[PDB]
Write a protein that binds this ligand. Structure first.
Ligand SMILES: Nc1nc2c(ncn2[C@@H]2O[C@H](COP(=O)(O)OP(=O)(O)O)[C@@H](O)[C@H]2O)c(=O)[nH]1
Ligand SMILES: Nc1nc2c(ncn2[C@@H]2O[C@H](COP(=O)(O)OP(=O)(O)O)[C@@H](O)[C@H]2O)c(=O)[nH]1
Ligand SMILES: [Mg+2]
Ligand SMILES: [Mg+2]
Lengths: 471, 465
């Protein structure tokens, strides 16, 4: 019915997640509702030892005392609940985080996430003190867990209502529980560490981001302290010593921790008022392991690579900002020649690339440099086409200020007398040609106008011939 | 000549790093070469206590025993070198990392980086065991420190790593068996085993080898020391007041062995060009790097959730632009459909973005896309125009071209107006033209407003004779 000894539930075979069918079969045979308690923390912090206490046994989850990690994967121990009749207590012992020999550092987050998803009570095991790194890791994995859970979902309860209750344990605790001159309980110490700072300013955003998350996903928190259990020369073989050879405060602290778990941990639930049993827990194991194996848990690349990308992206923005202010050398969009525009773009592009290199950091494959290159190319066509229509629009304005009076004169009839229209057009064409600061479009605008008015010239000549005969 | 007591060298004023001028002047007055030893680690790990041991004193850098952080900023203690005549030993005690009350989490990286840049021996203080998080933190800050050094440097130059301090990794409250794969190891062999890059060059190894290849490069000379729990757990709060026979005897011996190694192997701090650092040059380094940090030269390690938010939101905007670019399937008959199709396209890109977005704070990636799509709308709104003009102008050259030739011949030397009106209706009947239809025609009729009168003049003259 229940398990005399724990078994491995989830293995890391090679570097894939593998479920143990023997443990699944035993688990799915559990017909009672299950209270699931999981422990997670850095490796070599006495997690397996503490979990054996919850089972009320002296041995169980394997314990070791070298610098090397010991527990691998996630282990399962289904035992009768010692206090709640007709309930099964489900204990989950986990591979510790931060193993400096483990190549698959991302598997840490997978085990962390699985512990949050499978448990109803989550025991976060830390040493000496609350560290910001422990807070940020809980923050990061909680967000990744909620995202994965949303990618595997189909009324009013939010996803956060199904996260487990948080139990924060402090091992080898020695520092004074005193904050700003006031003595505090372990719970008040936890609250002070997790309390968002008041206000809305930028000075507070980063501090409050993980705490707003933990406040949201873990409303019910509990903190426990544990003294050093014995002299350090006796920590190896600790599980061999009877309670009267350990520190009395530690023995009582372990008892108070176990009593809280037995009295406050709840049956795991699922959306729709469903009480989880062994079979439904097996479905949760298979569901989430497959979701992780198919990529539903996001993966963040190493922080040095992410920071390099942020700095290179900033470097490209400073590069185009320096090429945009350097185009003040162009004192005129109607430039005289087109090659002077191209040369000024080249010197500005060349200067902007230097400021990019100055502000860049490990731009692998020049991927961010090539991006800047295609941006500056777009800046070339953008200035070459705005140059064209700056020449046209200015030249067209001169055609209506030099030739405007002649158009009115011809419309009146001044040149209906008995070829002196052509003579004055040529002198006004040279007038137009002498106007400084006309772009490269000058000849085109003028010739297009002369062809527009080449049909009026013929008619004026015709009329001149007709009137010559009359007298 | 030297300091009887330590002073604060760099303060945390509000949340900016500010240098204490009094300490700078005392430092710059030190004329002897300096051996600079700095300690860095998570807070409440006995850093200040251990530094007082290097000073050979029972008090010095302030020590406290509550859960709250104690040391703030960076403190400096210039003392005579205990073995080398005419040398000054410079001790740097640092604010601990990971303070859960500290809003300016980025100031951790600044203090770490300054400790690396100002020291010749770097003491990395950790508890119980070598942690992967401690390795990654050293990796990140070392890379950021080299970047800060590179942005403030302007001949056959020495490597940058050759000026980084020697690494001393201390393990406090050490209890685990120094045994790896059945073989007993020394503390140094334990450190090297933790930092040894894995062989293979495959992808399964890249992440593991990234921090270790870095630390191998910048810290070739490494040393590891273990320290037992120093005393009974009820007496740790008063450690610096207790005599040696109330501490663990192995701890007293371990502290002495640590101090002796530091004194015997630490080198005078050097700079490029065979320059030996003294008090004045150390002051110049302090001012150089503190100002560089205040001007933004030191990158900041962001929260992992924000890095994921930007990576996924950046993917979401690209997924948004993929569907608004695919919505183009230009000689359309109507102009308001241009606005209508842009509205359906802009609304479609916003909808696909939200589907793939994650923690878009301030709507910064949405608002950017909103103003981004407007530039795509206006770009197509006027590009339709110039496709209509160029087409409509082309029809004026095939419908009015023959009439223009007729006027040059003399066919209309008034029934010219009659055929212009019939060709104007011809042009108006030409299917498939945009808003420029009226534009080319009116500009053309204004171009051709002077020919009508001249032929009229000729017709009058011809009627006479
Ligand atoms: N300092 C300390 N050591 C402990 C404590 N509990 C157990 N240990 C010892 O720490 C070593 C590692 O314990 P273990 O259960 O394997 O840690 P785990 O890797 O987190 O599961 C064992 O030798 C234990 O005897 C504790 O509260 N404090
Ligand atoms: N467990 C332990 N405590 C220590 C050790 N060294 C000093 N302490 C105590 O730890 C507390 C914090 O020391 P402190 O120097 O202020 O740590 P810091 O914040 O890193 O500078 C003090 O009460 C010390 O008495 C050690 O090696 N192990
Ligand atoms: Mg274990
Ligand atoms: Mg201190």
């Amino acid at each position: 019915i229940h398990m005399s000894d724990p078994m491995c539930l989830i293995e890391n075979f090679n570097e894939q997640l593998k479920v143990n069918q023997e443990a699944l079969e035993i688990l799915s045979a559990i017909t009672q509702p299950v209270v699931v308690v999981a422990i997670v923390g850095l490796y070599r912090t006495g997690k397996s030892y503490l979990m054996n206490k919850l089972a009320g046994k002296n041995k169980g989850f394997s314990v070791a005392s070298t610098v090397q990690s010991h527990t691998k994967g996630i282990w399962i121990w289904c035992v009768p609940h010692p206090n709640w009749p007709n309930h099964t207590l489900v204990l989950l012992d986990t591979e510790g985080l931060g193993d400096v020999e483990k190549a698959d550092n991302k598997n840490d987050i997978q085990i962390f996430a699985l512990a949050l998803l499978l448990s109803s009570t989550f025991v976060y095991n830390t040493v000496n003190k609350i560290d910001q790194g422990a807070i940020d890791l809980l923050h990061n994995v909680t967000e990744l867990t909620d995202l994965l859970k949303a990618r595997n979902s189909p009324d009013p309860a939010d996803s956060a209502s199904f996260f487990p209750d948080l139990v924060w344990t402090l091992r080898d605790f020695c520092l004074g529980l005193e904050i700003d001159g006031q003595l505090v309980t372990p719970d008040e110490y936890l609250e002070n560490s997790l309390r968002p700072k008041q206000g809305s300013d930028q000075r507070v955003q980063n501090f409050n981001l993980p705490r707003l998350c933990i406040q949201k996903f873990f409303p019910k928190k509990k903190c426990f302290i544990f003294d050093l259990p014995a002299h350090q020369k006796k920590l190896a073989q600790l599980e061999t010593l009877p309670d009267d050879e350990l520190e009395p405060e530690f023995v009582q602290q372990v008892t108070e921790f176990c009593s809280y778990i037995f009295s406050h941990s709840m049956t795991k639930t699922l959306p729709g008022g469903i009480m989880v049993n062994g079979s439904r827990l097996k479905n949760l194991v298979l569901t989430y392991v497959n979701a992780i194996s198919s990529g539903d848990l996001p993966c963040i690349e190493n922080a040095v690579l992410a920071l390099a990308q942020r700095e290179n992206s900033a470097a490209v923005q400073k590069a185009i900002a320096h090429y945009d202010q350097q185009m003040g050398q162009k004192v005129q969009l109607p430039m005289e020649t087109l090659q002077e525009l191209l040369d000024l773009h080249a010197t500005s592009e060349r200067e902007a690339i230097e400021v990019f290199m100055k502000n860049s950091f490990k731009d692998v494959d020049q991927s961010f440099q090539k991006e800047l290159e295609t941006l500056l190319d777009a800046k070339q066509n953008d200035i070459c086409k705005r140059n064209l229509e700056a020449s046209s629009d200015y030249c067209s304005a001169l055609l209506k200020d030099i030739f405007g009076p002649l158009e009115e004169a011809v419309k009146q009839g001044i040149y209906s007398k008995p070829n002196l229209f052509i003579q004055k057009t040529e002198e006004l064409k040279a007038k137009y040609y002498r106007e400084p600061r006309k772009g490269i479009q000058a000849e085109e605008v003028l010739q297009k106008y002369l062809k527009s008015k080449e049909s009026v010239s013929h008619a004026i000549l015709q009329t001149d011939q007709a009137l010559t005969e009359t007298e």
